[PDB]
Amino acid sequence: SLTPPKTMFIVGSMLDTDWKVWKPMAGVYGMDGQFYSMIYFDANSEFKFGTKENEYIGINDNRVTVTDKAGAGVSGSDNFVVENAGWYLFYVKAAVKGDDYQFTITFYPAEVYLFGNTTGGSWAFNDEWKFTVPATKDGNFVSPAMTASGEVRMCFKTDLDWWRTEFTLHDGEIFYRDFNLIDSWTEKGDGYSIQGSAGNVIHLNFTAGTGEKK
Numbered sequence: 001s002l003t004p005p006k007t008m009f010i011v012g013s014m015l016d017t018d019w020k021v022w023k024p025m026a027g028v029y030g031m032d033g034q035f036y037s038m039i040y041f042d043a044n045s046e047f048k049f050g051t052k053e054n055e056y057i058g059i060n061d062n063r064v065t066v067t068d069k070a071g072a073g074v075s076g077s078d079n080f081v082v083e084n085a086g087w088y089l090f091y092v093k094a095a096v097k098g099d100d101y102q103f104t105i106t107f108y109p110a111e112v113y114l115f116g117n118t119t120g121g122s123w124a125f126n127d128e129w130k131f132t133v134p135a136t137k138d139g140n141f142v143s144p145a146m147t148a149s150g151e152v153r154m155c156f157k158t159d160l161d162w163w164r165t166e167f168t169l170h171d172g173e174i175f176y177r178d179f180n181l182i183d184s185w186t187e188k189g190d191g192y193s194i195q196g197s198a199g200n201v202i203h204l205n206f207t208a209g210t211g212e213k214k
């Protein structure tokens with residue numbers, strides 16, 4: 001009778017040294033009970049995660065599996081502990097099996113990409129098009145300069161199709177795709193679509209959750 005959860009949060013010391021802030025994780029398009037979030041972790045950050053606020057699941061729970069693909073260095077005995085300071089893409093997959101959930105936690109490298117007509121029409125992960133990564137909690141990811149004109153497209157890289165984890169700028173805010181998108185973001189609304197030309201760059205700040213074309 002159980003279905004996969006609709007919400008995921010993360011909580012811990014890289015957000016609030018008091019564990020009082022719960023980051024709601026963005027949901028992976030078209031795939032149920034999978035979530036992703038771009039977070040800076042300090043060295044020996046401690047965190048847990050949960051489905052609702054004030055649920056605390058940690059590394060020792062037998063429903064839980066960790067997969068490190070970022071060299072974050074994940075360990076701990078209750079809390080999750082991330083050894084190496086860095087931006088990482090925190091990624092959770094909750095699947096039903098039996099009457100309980102079964103979590104897969106994956107750290108992906110902080111890899112953000114420009115796609116689409118703004119790039120001369122790359123529709124695949126291509127390292128010419130990867131944002132540089134800021135050193136601090138508060139820096140920006142910045143794209144390389146665009147080489148053509150059109151709608152801007154942006155995504156993170158995972159083991160899934162790119163467009164399942166892509167996003168844009170609505171009103172200075174970072175908006176993660178949550179509908180069926182075919183030709184353009186204007187399918188959502190305008191000032192969801194974001195018009196670029198040769199020379200432009202994006203700045204993203206994922207701590208704030210904002211960004212801007214420049």
Ligand SMILES: OC[C@H]1O[C@@H]2O[C@H]3[C@H](O)[C@@H](O)[C@@H](O[C@H]4[C@H](O)[C@@H](O)[C@@H](O[C@H]5[C@H](O)[C@@H](O)[C@@H](O[C@H]6[C@H](O)[C@@H](O)[C@@H](O[C@H]7[C@H](O)[C@@H](O)[C@@H](O[C@H]1[C@H](O)[C@H]2O)O[C@@H]7CO)O[C@@H]6CO)O[C@@H]5CO)O[C@@H]4CO)O[C@@H]3CO
Binds near residue numbers: 056
């Ligand atoms: O500020 C105090 C506290 O701050 C930080 O703790 C974090 C913690 O690391 C996070 O995991 C989270 O805690 C969650 C738990 O994850 C969650 O399971 C639940 O915890 C309940 C326990 O399962 C239950 O056994 C009992 O906890 C007891 C605990 O066994 C005792 O040890 C005692 O806790 C004290 C710590 O021992 C002490 O080191 C310090 O904790 C710091 C911690 O170092 C830091 O990382 O103080 C605490 C108590 O103040 O007492 C508790 C019961 O009081 O009951 C808890 C339910 O509370 O819930 C907690 C969140 O409350 O978040 C905390 C920060 O809040």
